[PDB]
Subunit: 176 residues, 2 copies
């Protein structure tokens, strides 16, 4: 089951853009193999936060997490940050050994920074490498401008879209 070549894909939602001042309010994970085939989907967790944190979000986050239903899910959740971290680690441990996988997704530097502050045990579970699908997005936009046009509010859909985007580049942008 564990395989050091498997990939951990993660997507977070936050109350804001500052990893040190804002907090995580949703997380989800998916594990693929090294050739991007989905092995298992992880839990989608809304992380409880006090009401003043929800009220303090800026106008974009207030509207977006409001109409997605996440704000209400956060208020109703009884899962703390630490419980969400432990639940996610308990899933990932079945599929990927410690320190093996890069953190995989779109602009996952932002996600790693939030994990380092708020879920450092989970952050430390990753290899130090980042696998950033948006690096390839930027290169394709400049070098193959319509490989980019040949190619999501639910968490697992967002991650599936990131895996699909990398599959698209492996097939039409990368020379294997």
């Amino acid at each position: 089951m564990q395989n050091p070549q498997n990939l951990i894909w993660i997507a977070l939602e936050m109350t804001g853009l500052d990893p040190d001042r804002d907090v995580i309010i949703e997380m989800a994970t998916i594990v693929t193999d090294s050739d991007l085939n989905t092995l298992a989907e992880g839990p989608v967790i809304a992380i409880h936060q006090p009401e003043e944190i929800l009220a303090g979000m800026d106008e974009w986050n207030t509207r977006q997490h409001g109409q997605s239903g996440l704000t209400q899910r956060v208020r109703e959740s009884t899962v703390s940050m630490a419980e969400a971290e432990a639940q996610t680690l308990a899933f990932l441990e079945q599929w990927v050994p410690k320190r093996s996988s890069p953190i995989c997704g779109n602009s996952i530097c932002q996600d790693r920074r939030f994990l380092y502050r708020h879920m450092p045990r989970l952050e430390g579970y990753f290899h130090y490498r980042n696998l950033d699908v948006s690096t390839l997005k930027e290169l394709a936009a400049r070098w193959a401008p319509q490989v980019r046009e040949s190619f999501t509010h639910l968490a697992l859909d967002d991650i599936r879209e990131s895996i699909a985007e990398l599959r698209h580049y492996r097939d039409h942008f990368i020379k294997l």
Copy 2:
């Protein structure tokens, strides 16, 4: 002269790897066009730091920056963190518009962390995306190992090698 397609490459030296404990002590930039041709090399700035900050460095950093001469350059420098940020912004503004270029280089999530904390105006001048060559290296390691295998003491050589590493992957790992 400004072109929203131009890429900003950056390299930093720090007293250590933790932005809460450590500070930037050297910075350098290079601007390329979208096809990795040098347009201009920016200033290489040693950033002054008081002696207790220089004393507060651990063993590996105290030795590595002492031996390279950076510590002495920092002790002597009359350029503050804010002035170095302004000097670098004055250069980049001649070539790239605001919020257009991602941060380009290797291990540039760590750079973004330091810029966010210590040079927020320069950090905000970049597009929020990262163009990390190590994403390509990780993919080549899994999917085309011979390309990774078939491929920096001073700041401008250090950046130029990162540009040469991307160029290598464009020529042997990207199909165009």
